[PDB]
Amino acid sequence: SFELTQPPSVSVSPGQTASITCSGDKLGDIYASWYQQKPGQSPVVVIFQDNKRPSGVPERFSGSNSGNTATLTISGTQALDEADYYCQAWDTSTSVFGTGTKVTVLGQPKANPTVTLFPPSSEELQANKATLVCLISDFYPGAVTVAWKADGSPVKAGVETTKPSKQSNNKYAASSYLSLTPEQWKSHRSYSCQVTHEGSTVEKTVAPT
Amino acid sequence: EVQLVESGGGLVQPGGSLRLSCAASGFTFSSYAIHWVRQAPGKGLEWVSGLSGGGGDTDYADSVKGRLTISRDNSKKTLFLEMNNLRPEDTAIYYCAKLTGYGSTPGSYMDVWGKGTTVSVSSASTKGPSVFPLAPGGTAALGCLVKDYFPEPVTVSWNSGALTSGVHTFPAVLQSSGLYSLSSVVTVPSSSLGTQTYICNVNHKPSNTKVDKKVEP
Numbered sequence: 001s002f003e004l005t006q007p008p009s010v011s012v013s014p015g016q017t018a019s020i021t022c023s024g025d026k027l028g029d030i031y032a033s034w035y036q037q038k039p040g041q042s043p044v045v046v047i048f049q050d051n052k053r054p055s056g057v058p059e060r061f062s063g064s065n066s067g068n069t070a071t072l073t074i075s076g077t078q079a080l081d082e083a084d085y086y087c088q089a090w091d092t093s094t095s096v097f098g099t100g101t102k103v104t105v106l107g108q109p110k111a112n113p114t115v116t117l118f119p120p121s122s123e124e125l126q127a128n129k130a131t132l133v134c135l136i137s138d139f140y141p142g143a144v145t146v147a148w149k150a151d152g153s154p155v156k157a158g159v160e161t162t163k164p165s166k167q168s169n170n171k172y173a174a175s176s177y178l179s180l181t182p183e184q185w186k187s188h189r190s191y192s193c194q195v196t197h198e199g200s201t202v203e204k205t206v207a208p209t
Numbered sequence: 210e211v212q213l214v215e216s217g218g219g220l221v222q223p224g225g226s227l228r229l230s231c232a233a234s235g236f237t238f239s240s241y242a243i244h245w246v247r248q249a250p251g252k253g254l255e256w257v258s259g260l261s262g263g264g265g266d267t268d269y270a271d272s273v274k275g276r277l278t279i280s281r282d283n284s285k286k287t288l289f290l291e292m293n294n295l296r297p298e299d300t301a302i303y304y305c306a307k308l309t310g311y312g313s314t315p316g317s318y319m320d321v322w323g324k325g326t327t328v329s330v331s332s333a334s335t336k337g338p339s340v341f342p343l344a345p346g347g348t349a350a351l352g353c354l355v356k357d358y359f360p361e362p363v364t365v366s367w368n369s370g371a372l373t374s375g376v377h378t379f380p381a382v383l384q385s386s387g388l389y390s391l392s393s394v395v396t397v398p399s400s401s402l403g404t405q406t407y408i409c410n411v412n413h414k415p416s417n418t419k420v421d422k423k424v425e426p
């Protein structure tokens with residue numbers, strides 16, 4: 001499989017030009033296509049054969065395939081152009097999609113997340129389990145990384161983190177859960193849920209007491 | 210009138226099998242190659258398989274080469290995908306898409322797509338949750354952890370529907386185990402704590418599970 005690499009995320013303000021790139025060695029020798037997928041929906045073709053538009057596609061969408069790189073341009077980007085965009089190319093008879101780009105059309109000021117961290121309940125400890133619950137809310141735009149620490153040392157095992165989901169207020173929420181044993185829980189000074197968003201980090205800490 | 214409709218999606222145990230179909234309307238099915246594209250929850254598009262208009266030339270992604278078989282009955286305007294020895298990694302919405310040609314030519318594209326059909330490959334079995342009370346200026350965060358349940362969904366109310374404005378019920382995580390865990394939090398007065406009673410009402414209809422959990426500090 002030849003791999004078509006796209007930048008994972010692009011932000012654009014309404015009215016501005018959104019540039020989405022797609023790179024790969026076999027690209028440029030071959031024709032590139034672009035598919036748009038709005039939330040909850042099937043993908044839709046917007047560009048084919050590098051720079052052609054299907055009849056129904058608006059003119060503000062355009063494409064170019066210079067060298068090893070294909071680019072989708074969205075002029076005068078509208079809020080409804082907010083979607084995941086995927087490039088595609090045919091390797092002989094094998095179809096390959098690019099890794100995808102999330103295009104956020106900024107509709108709202110940046111909002112850092114409200115993070116709430118709960119320790120294990122006594123009832124759960126009585127059942128010989130321990131879950132740390134880290135809840136992330138009201139963040140925009142809708143991309144976060146979660147990291148767990150034990151006494152400020154990274155913890156990668158026992159971590160189950162959701163992908164962000166859009167709240168009714170158009171901000172995003174997410175959850176992360178850390179599984180521990182009662183013994184692990186009682187044998188450390190502190191546990192921390194550390195949430196990074198737009199280059200700001202929020203840390204909440206809980207301790208056995 | 211031009212539409213593709215996928216069928217056959219469902220929950221399947223790993224190692225099991227599933228047959229997917231795709232019914233075409235509004236065009237001459239035989240005149241066009243049809244392909245299957247899948248997408249795992251929260252992840253990117255992944256090409257699975259493709260078939261020429263006549264059904265002669267069949268093409269498969271490396272990830273599915275042995276386990277999957279694509280075929281078509283043009284008389285029934287239907288495409289099929291036979292999936293065997295399913296893996297958890299095959300969990301995805303499966304879309305059928307129609308090419309603009311009879312075959313997979315250079316500058317050909319998928320002009321029409323269906324709404325898709327959902328395949329879940331999980332070893333999990335129906336199981337109701339264990340509900341645990343999540344406790345700690347002017348406000349206090351109180352919560353209910355709804356743990357280790359299958360399948361979706363779960364409904365959470367507070368004080369039987371009396372508190373809703375300051376309530377945030379988060380989407381579930383799917384754990385490695387195949388079980389779901391969800392959490393609901395409510396914002397309340399910190400002064401009222403120890404005076405007021407806060408109860409989350411958890412309902413998991415698939416397991417006929419109702420739990421009323423009193424949350425105290």
